[PDB]
């Protein structure tokens, strides 16, 4: 039957960027028109695939990676990008074939006095490999003396809370991002348009 795309877009809670949530879509008939023709999707970037012709292609598998980030960190969800989120939270491959969709969720992800339920990883010993996930909460030893798994001087918790509020500029307001990755593997196609 039809795909769960609008069950991924209209999900009531989106995961933290450091623990982005992946849904696998297969044995389906994908209708991308509803996604491409919805008003709030302020960003709709497709890499290696044309948004209008998407209905004319079938892929073996489709993945939907959904997470919440700041408005100014939405530029990092794209191939070849580097920074706070590409390096440590969600890395896309340079040969990415898919579409990145982001919309502002200020009316539903921002709480007066701060919404600290959304976290991100700002310290990591090395960059992430594309489509890698790292949900470890181990204390990050930024110093020389082993600080024995207790936050202190020169060793911090690698996860930082976003702390959204209804005010703040559009760059600091929450943005709900879902990335569609289209896959072909020589296996029989299972997600078509018509």
């Amino acid at each position: 039957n039809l795909c769960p795309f609008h069950e991924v877009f209209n999900a009531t809670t989106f995961a933290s960027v450091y623990a982005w949530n992946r849904k696998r879509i297969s044995n389906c008939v994908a209708d991308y028109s509803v996604i491409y023709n919805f008003a709030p999707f302020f960003a709709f970037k497709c890499y290696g695939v044309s948004p209008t012709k998407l209905n004319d292609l079938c892929f073996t598998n489709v993945y939907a990676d959904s997470f919440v980030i700041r408005g100014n960190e939405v530029s990092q969800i794209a191939p070849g990008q580097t920074g706070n989120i590409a390096d440590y939270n969600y890395k896309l491959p340079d040969d990415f074939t898919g579409c990145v969709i982001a919309w502002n969720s200020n009316k539903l992800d921002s709480k007066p006095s701060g919404n600290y339920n959304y976290l991100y990883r700002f310290l990591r010993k090395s960059k992430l490999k594309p489509f890698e996930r790292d949900i470890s909460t181990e204390i990050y030893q930024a110093g020389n003396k082993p600080c024995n798994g207790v936050a202190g001087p020169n060793c911090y918790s690698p996860l930082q809370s976003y702390g959204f509020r209804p005010t703040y500029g559009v760059g600091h307001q929450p943005y709900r991002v879902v990335v569609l990755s289209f896959e072909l593997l020589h296996a029989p196609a299972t997600v078509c348009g018509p």
Partner: antibody
Amino acid sequence: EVQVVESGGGLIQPGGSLRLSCTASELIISRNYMSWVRQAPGKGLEWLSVIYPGGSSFYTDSLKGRFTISRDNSKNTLYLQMNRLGVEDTAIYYCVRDAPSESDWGQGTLVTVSS
Amino acid sequence: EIVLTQSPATLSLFPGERATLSCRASQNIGHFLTWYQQKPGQAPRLLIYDASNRATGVPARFSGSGSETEFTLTISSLGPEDFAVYYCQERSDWPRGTFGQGTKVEIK
């Protein structure tokens, strides 16, 4: 007190090049958000460049191409290659380590770009 | 580019008085503002991060407030060692940011 020690700063002719070097005592420079800041003589501070713990480096728009921040993971030293230096590039260059609740600046190494 | 305006340029006060410093941002930067203190011949010292949180080791007399585009730093009782130049830096793109011009505290 965490000590970050700069070096390599001194007189240089306009159009010349310098490579300031920064090292720290009780921290690993390859694991910290190490930036470079300068304070032009008698003026306000200016942030120049940053290198992330993973290796991503970012610069101000006015310095892209000229200044090149790097580091030596074996020597525990942070560098700032400075090319095509002008007279206006005179300042005291600070090597500041950034943490959410901490910011450890170095004493600063004066760079004088004059003939 | 975000430009921060600090007023007054110089703040003349007696020791023990209450000092209030202001830093106005051209764009809404939320709570992402940092306050530094620079003695003459010394590197800046982090006082307040996130515009309200007091850095470790800072005496309780320092207190930052405000949000969005109006931030202030309040010193309850100017000590003998609280006369310096105070910089406000917007950290909307932490660790990057633009400083203010400074608010020197000088009486005589």
